[PDB]
Design a protein around this ligand. Sequence first.
Ligand SMILES: Cc1ccc(O)c(C)c1-n1c(N)c(C(N)=O)c2nc3c(Br)cccc3nc21
Length: 270
Amino acid sequence: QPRRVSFRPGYDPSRPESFFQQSFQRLSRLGHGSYGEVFKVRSKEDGRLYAVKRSMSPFRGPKDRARKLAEVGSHEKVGQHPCCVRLEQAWEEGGILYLQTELCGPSLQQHCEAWGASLPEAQVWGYLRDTLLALAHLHSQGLVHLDVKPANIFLGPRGRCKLGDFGLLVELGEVQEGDPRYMAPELLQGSYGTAADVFSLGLTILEVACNMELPHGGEGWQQLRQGYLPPEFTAGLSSELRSVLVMMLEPDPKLRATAEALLALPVLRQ
Ligand SMILES: Cc1ccc(O)c(C)c1-n1c(N)c(C(N)=O)c2nc3c(Br)cccc3nc21
């Protein structure tokens, strides 16, 4: 029996088919991986198109179930913000967790691969703005995403982007590992705060604006975490963008800029 999942219609219960196969039509499989599978679907009760994620394998034990279900709780804490992917409903059946979210466009990672070049700064600034708006919303409620990267930012109409994948989200006041390429240096010493997301967004913007593959480790990983940007790729960057990037990549989290401060800056105002 399927049961809804929260931390706050074609039913056919008798029929021997899953609620997913009974309440929705799988138009496409947007993606797949260890997390499971993401499908493009249209509600068989509302007709509107939505995105659904399902886990690959059934719950192994009590812990696996709790760890997976936490994303629902984390998604609920984020709430409804214009620049954050909104969750409609979440449920479980057969040891499988399902999350139904608004259908968004392609990820910033995909868009960048297709463009195959440094994105125009006009698009870049807007993504920086909306993502900063989203982070400020999370930071105000004592939430840290910890996995800000191109793949977790989804594009929308008229050059707008929304933040998603709140699985690694932690409420300031249990932490999972994130991608080393985008992690703030303070995390190595266990210092976790909203500043970390800002640094991740900085490397995110640097990656898409200079078509630069971020280093997983080594000296290159260090150079980007010493407050000095590499002049070889940052050549085409405008003076204004570079200054904003230096603020976000400030090694010391105590001195690093905050989202609201950056958003208040004139270049990033509206
Ligand atoms: C399904 C889901 C649940 C929770 C959550 O936080 C998010 C952001 C989503 N979610 C979307 N709403 C996607 C979209 N296109 O609308 C979307 N695409 C994905 C791709 Br492509 C690859 C891997 C994972 C994806 N997860 C996605």
